[PDB]
């Protein structure tokens, strides 16, 4: 497995294009009818930073949950004692740029549990192998992963 390079995105197209995670459909709000589409991930082998102390980072689409759970397994196999960590998931708060897939519960920003920045290139490769539709080595501090809509 070869790590992604810094600022590399796979596939090599923009996130919201047809061959990556596709079109932003619209923002999902807590009060809404579309909220019921989101399902909480309480996998004990995934660390959720829970920046807002709401548990909102756990709420994600079915495909997001499926690819995140596969990545949780490959992270533990890659580095025994280390877990997948989510820094940002579903965004109720406008903390991402306009038309972010975070607003749709279709995207996670991730690290390893030990916050070893040197692991993040390989983490991104693992995210691609776990079947995330778009993977972006966005900063030294995190990998951005998203999925297609249901």
């Amino acid at each position: 497995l070869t790590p992604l390079a810094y600022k590399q995105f796979i596939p090599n197209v923009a996130e919201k294009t047809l061959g990556a995670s596709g079109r932003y459909e619209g923002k999902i709000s807590r009060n809404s009818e579309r909220f019921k589409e989101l399902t909480p991930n309480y996998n004990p082998d995934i660390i959720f930073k829970d920046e807002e102390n709401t548990g909102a980072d756990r709420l994600m689409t079915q495909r997001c949950k499926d690819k995140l759970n596969a990545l949780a397994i490959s992270v533990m196999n890659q580095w025994p004692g280390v877990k997948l960590r989510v820094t940002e998931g579903w965004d109720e708060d406008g903390h991402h740029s306009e038309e972010s897939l975070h607003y749709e519960g279709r995207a996670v920003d991730i690290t390893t549990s030990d916050r070893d920045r040197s692991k993040y290139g390989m983490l991104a490769r693992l995210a691609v192998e776990a079947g995330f539709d778009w993977v972006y080595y966005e900063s030294k501090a995190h990998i951005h992963c998203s999925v297609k809509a249901e």
Partner: antibody, heavy 119, light 108 residues
């Protein structure tokens, strides 16, 4: 509401050290890196270093390696910057500033501590 | 260490007019370029990161562009309250380094 509260202004004699403080509230203090930034007339904004409370890791700008020491007290949510052997070139405003795990850039800043080095 | 050359050093502009600030890195810094606004007596305030991403609650009139060495910050339609020193900062290289700033002054 995230807040970084710095200690007051300091008058310090040349040759002497000073230790200035930065208390975080409104977030889990241990979870974010805390950076220190100098603002003088002579050199505008300069990054001094970072401490990662969660690991005790420190990274210093080589220009400050002999000057600065960063520590943290987790139980008081307070970061400290000690500046040793002061000269007039150390007179400046010192800021603490946090990142939020998106890179080494700073959403929340302390109000700044003015340090005047003088006899 | 990476050197950030910010131009111009100052600008006098009327409310409603455009401001264009340039930041040039001494080597490529990918998109790891942050813009801050420092109003007098205050700490710097984060406006733009990753060269073009507005921070939460930053108004639309502030944009940024660039990748590599050459970065542009724009205020589309400057407001009276936008008087400040603006700074760019790179964090591709360690240590992070800042530009010298651009003072924006209002003509009325």
């Amino acid at each position: 509401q995230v807040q970084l509260q710095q200690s007051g202004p300091e008058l310090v004699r040349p040759g002497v050290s000073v230790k200035i403080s930065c208390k975080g509230s409104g977030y889990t203090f241990i979870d974010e890196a805390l950076h220190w930034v100098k603002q003088s007339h002579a050199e505008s904004l300069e990054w001094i270093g970072v401490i990662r409370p969660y690991s005790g890791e420190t990274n210093y700008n080589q220009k400050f390696k002999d000057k600065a020491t960063m520590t943290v007290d987790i139980s008081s949510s307070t970061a400290y910057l000690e500046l040793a052997r002061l000269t007039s070139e150390d007179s400046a405003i010192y800021y603490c500033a946090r990142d939020w795990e998106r890179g080494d850039f700073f959403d929340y800043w302390g109000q700044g501590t003015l340090v005047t080095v003088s006899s | 260490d990476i050197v950030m050359t910010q131009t111009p050093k100052f600008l006098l502009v009327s409310a409603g007019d455009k401001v264009t600030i340039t930041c040039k890195a001494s080597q490529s810094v990918s998109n790891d370029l942050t813009w801050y606004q420092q109003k007098p007596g205050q700490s710097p305030k984060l406006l733009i990161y990753y060269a073009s991403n507005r921070y939460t609650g930053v108004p639309d009139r502030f944009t940024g562009s660039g990748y590599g060495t050459d970065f542009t910050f724009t205020i589309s339609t400057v407001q009276a309250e936008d008087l400040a020193v603006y700074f760019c900062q790179q964090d591709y290289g360690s240590p992070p380094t800042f530009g010298g700033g651009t003072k924006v002054e209002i003509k009325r």
